[PDB]
Design a protein around this ligand. Structure first.
Ligand SMILES: CCCCCCCCCCCCCCCCC[C@@H](O)O[C@H](CO[C@H](O)CCCCCCCCCCCCCCC)COP(=O)(O)OCC[N+](C)(C)C
Lengths: 57, 70
């Protein structure tokens, strides 16, 4: 019943973070201290919408 | 003398029969009505009777669940 809506392949393109898990873990503490605001906005949107398609931006 | 000392008048038995007949007629119509009401409640389930339990919604936990999509 109904048709599922999916974003197009162009809609899912982004400049990808191509560093490995060791680099990420080394940076993690300062990364969380510095990039807190966009991350918190995304996670609040993510548990409030309950939908990946509503959180792409 | 026998009528005066042992028995009563006809009105007594007449009106006692009237009261008894009323009681029995109301009991009969109440029995029919109750049977129909029971049938309707068992079929439709909207009455106070034949109410079968369902899960209490106060047991549900409404909190963030480690994953955004529940
Ligand atoms: C010449 C005579 C001709 C007539 C013969 C009459 C014979 C009388 C004996 C036969 C009686 C038949 C049976 C009757 C039983 C039911 C009677 C009962 O309904 O009356 C009650 C009273 O019952 C009597 O006391 C019963 C009498 C029993 C004795 C009968 C006679 C034989 C007794 C023998 C005893 C022997 C003992 C040993 C001796 C040595 C009170 O009634 P109640 O519910 O208020 O009525 C309401 C209407 N009122 C107010 C107008 C009255």
């Amino acid at each position: 019943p109904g048709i599922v809506e999916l974003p197009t392949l162009e809609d899912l393109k982004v400049q990808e973070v191509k560093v490995s898990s060791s680099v990420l873990k080394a940076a993690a503490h300062h990364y969380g201290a510095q990039c807190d605001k966009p991350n918190k906005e995304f996670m609040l949107c993510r548990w409030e919408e309950k939908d990946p398609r509503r959180c792409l931006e | 003398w026998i009528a005066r000392t042992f028995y009563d008048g006809p009105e007594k038995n007449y009106e006692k029969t009237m009261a008894i007949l009323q009681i029995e007629a109301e009991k009969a119509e109440l029995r029919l009505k109750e049977l129909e009401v029971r049938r309707l409640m068992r079929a439709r389930g909207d009455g106070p009777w034949y109410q079968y339990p369902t899960i209490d919604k106060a047991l549900i936990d409404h909190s963030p669940k480690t994953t955004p999509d529940n």
